[PDB]
Design a protein around this nucleic acid. Structure first.
Ligand code: NA
Length: 282
DNA sequence: CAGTACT
DNA sequence: GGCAGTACTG
């Protein structure tokens, strides 16, 4: 990632959702598959593919159809309406991603679900109440969500299709991600999930250089690299994260939180000039 | 875990 | 020698 026959096949096959270099090489080696179209053709007869991979394959065409800005507006409205219906006024939905950066086309619908600033406090992480699952099930019963790639208490990834509009128009299925985020974490999650990816990396490096940890959950003042390392020793998890569980920082990391109300707060604390979403494509 | 995904 | 950071799958 830093530097950035069998190789060319890997380059082909990793276009498919669920397939990385490892699954690709196994397709090549075990199955003798060189191209996407061979994989599409053989998929059903390779018993070892995951359910998620089978979704990536079955929806290959849809996934690679870009979403026009105007359809994203409809997805946003729809998600907000359904959120209001089944979750009520305590909850809100915001669509981020390249759409919020105002690109004419996007590759998916990237949503944040969170409690409003006015909602009563909870005594538990919001992801422990099972609200993401309730919301997902609601959207499935409506046939908006029609296939799941992966779902946990914090994050849903799947396929969503707007219902037909009346001549009648049938919509394409679209990649939909939904993340359940604590209220105080909204501005940092908006930053993260609006991106771009390179933008986030640059800002996280700026945070590191000033002795902060920046992630979607918050901005945390760590101090020296050694104080940071000492902290990571205590609560940091090798292949997982710096110390959150169910979207809530562990106490010792929470103690380091610098509260923010807005994206602007984060730029300011890091000594960076504000950039509007549409100017976050470095 | 190791793979894969996401911004 | 470490790098941006974190979620779900099996
Ligand atoms: Na892929």
């Amino acid at each position: 990632k830093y530097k950035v026959p069998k190789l060319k096949a890997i380059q082909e096959l990793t276009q498919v959702h669920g397939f990385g270099p490892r699954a690709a090489a196994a397709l090549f080696d075990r199955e003798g598959i060189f191209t996407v179209d061979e994989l599409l053709q053989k998929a059903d007869s390779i018993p070892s593919l995951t359910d998620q991979q089978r979704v990536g394959i079955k929806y290959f065409y849809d996934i690679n159809e870009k979403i026009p800005m105007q359809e994203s507006v409809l997805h946003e409205n729809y998600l907000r309406e359904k959120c209001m219906e089944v979750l009520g006024k305590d909850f809100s939905i915001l669509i981020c991603g390249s759409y919020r950066r105002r690109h004419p086309f996007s590759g998916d619908v990237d949503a944040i679900l969170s409690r409003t600033l006015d909602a009563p406090p909870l005594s538990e992480p919001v992801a422990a109440t099972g609200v993401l699952g309730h919301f997902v099930e609601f959207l499935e019963s409506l046939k908006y969500l029609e296939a799941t790639m992966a779902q946990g208490p914090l994050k849903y990834m799947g396929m969503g299709r707007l219902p037909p509009r009346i001549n009648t128009k049938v919509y394409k299925a679209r990649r939909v991600d939904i993340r359940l985020i604590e209220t105080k974490s909204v501005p940092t999650a908006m930053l993260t999930f609006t991106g771009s990816k390179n933008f986030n990396v640059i800002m996280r490096q700026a945070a590191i250089s000033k002795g902060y940890l920046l992630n979607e959950y918050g901005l945390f003042k760590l101090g020296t690299p050694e104080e940071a390392r000492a902290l990571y020793e205590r609560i940091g998890i090798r292949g997982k994260n710096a110390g959150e569980e169910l979207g809530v920082p562990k106490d010792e990391l929470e103690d380091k939180r610098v509260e923010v109300r807005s994206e602007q707060d984060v730029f300011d604390v890091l000594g960076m000039p504000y950039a509007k979403p549409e100017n976050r494509d470095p």
